[PDB]
């Protein structure tokens, strides 16, 4: 059984069979979204992914490695075997590393790395391609607001004019400022307490969410999850902290129009 779709990732750009040519080697690029057929990628019974009857294919098994195009017949079968798991990562299950856009302009070329739960290691298999927009409803029914850069992020009552409660959800598992898309949710650390603000987007694991299936949102490298602090509002601080199934750690997304 298969299926074909768009692989989007950092800075809401797509996985990318340079300027269509299908040459053994062609390394895989970033490149913004659109419908050519060397973004469109198959995913079948056999853990390939395919574009142009090629296979999306590991050049080496250790960290660093580029991810390139090739003939699936002639390639290693561990080099053409990927999973997508449910955070958002792309796996080489053979060696364990994930597809990485290392750096975010486009024609970057992607490559295999250990898993840090980055940013540029997460990715939406999609046929849409644009960020969806979204407010994030929270602990008592308000909404999560951004305050500027380096700024905290906060809860306010929910306003449908507020272009600061706006946010840009993106293929990359970033959450955005809907108005400033340089702008990314990010943990300032790793530790229970550490305050969310944000900051300018750099593919961090800091930057990076994932909205689970308990209604927490989820910072995969900590596994904290997003809280309200003290389940008091007029703190106006949104921290990381362990999941406990409280009311100030559940958030919905309610798409903007
Ligand atoms: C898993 O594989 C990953 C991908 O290869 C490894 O990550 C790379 O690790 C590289 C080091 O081995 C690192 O390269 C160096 O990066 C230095 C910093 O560059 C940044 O900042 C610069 C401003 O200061 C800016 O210009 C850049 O654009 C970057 O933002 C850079 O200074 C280094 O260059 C110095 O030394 C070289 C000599 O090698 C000089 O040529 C250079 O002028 C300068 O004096 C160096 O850059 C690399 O230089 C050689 C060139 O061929 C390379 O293309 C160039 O990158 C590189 O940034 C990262 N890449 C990524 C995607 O993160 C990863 O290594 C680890 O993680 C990184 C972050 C780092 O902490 C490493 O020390 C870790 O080992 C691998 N994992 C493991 C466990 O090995
Ligand atoms: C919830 O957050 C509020 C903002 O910090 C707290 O109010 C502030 O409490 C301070 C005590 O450390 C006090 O100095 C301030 O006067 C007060 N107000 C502001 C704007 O700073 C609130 O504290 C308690 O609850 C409210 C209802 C007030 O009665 C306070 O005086 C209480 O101490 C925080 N705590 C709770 C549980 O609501
Ligand atoms: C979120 O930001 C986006 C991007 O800036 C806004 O969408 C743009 O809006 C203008 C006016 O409608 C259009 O001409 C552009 O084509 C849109 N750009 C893109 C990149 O799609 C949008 O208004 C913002 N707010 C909402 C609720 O989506
Ligand atoms: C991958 O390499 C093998 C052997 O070196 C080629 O036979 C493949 O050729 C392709 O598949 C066969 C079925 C035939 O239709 C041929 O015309 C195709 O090009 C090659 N695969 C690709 C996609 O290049």
């Known amino acids: 059984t298969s299926f074909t779709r768009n692989i989007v990732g950092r800075d809401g750009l797509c996985v990318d069979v340079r300027n269509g040519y299908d040459t053994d080697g062609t390394p895989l690029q970033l490149w913004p979204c659109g419908t050519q057929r060397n973004q469109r990628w198959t995913f079948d019974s056999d853990d390939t992914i395919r574009s142009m009857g090629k296979c999306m294919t590991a050049n080496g098994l250790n960290n660093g490695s580029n991810i390139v195009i090739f003939n699936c017949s002639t390639a290693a079968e561990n080099a053409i075997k990927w999973e997508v798991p449910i955070d958002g990562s792309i796996i080489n299950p053979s060696s364990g590393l994930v597809m990485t856009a290392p750096r975010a302009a486009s024609r970057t070329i992607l490559l295999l790395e250990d898993n840090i739960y980055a940013a540029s290691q997460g990715w939406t298999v999609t046929n849409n391609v644009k960020p969806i927009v979204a407010s994030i409803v929270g602990y008592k029914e308000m909404c999560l607001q951004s305050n500027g850069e380096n700024n905290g992020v906060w809860m306010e009552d929910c306003e449908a004019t507020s272009l600061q409660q706006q946010w ?52 995969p490298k900590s596994r904290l999850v997003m809280d309200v602090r003290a389940s008091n509002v007029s703190l106006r601080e949104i921290i990381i902290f362990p999941a406990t199934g409280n009311p100030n750690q559940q958030w919905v997304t309610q798409v903007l129009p």
């Not at 959800?169 to 400022?177: E, N, W």
């Not at 530790?191 to 750099?202: A, E, F, T």
Request: glycine share 10%; net charge positive.
């Open 168 to 219: 840009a959800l993106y293929g990359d598992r970033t959450i955005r400022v809907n108005s400033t898309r340089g702008l990314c949710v990010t943990t300032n650390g790793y530790n229970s307490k550490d305050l969310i603000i944000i900051l300018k987007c750099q593919g961090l694991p800091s930057q990076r969410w994932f909205f689970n299936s308990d209604g927490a949102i989820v910072n």
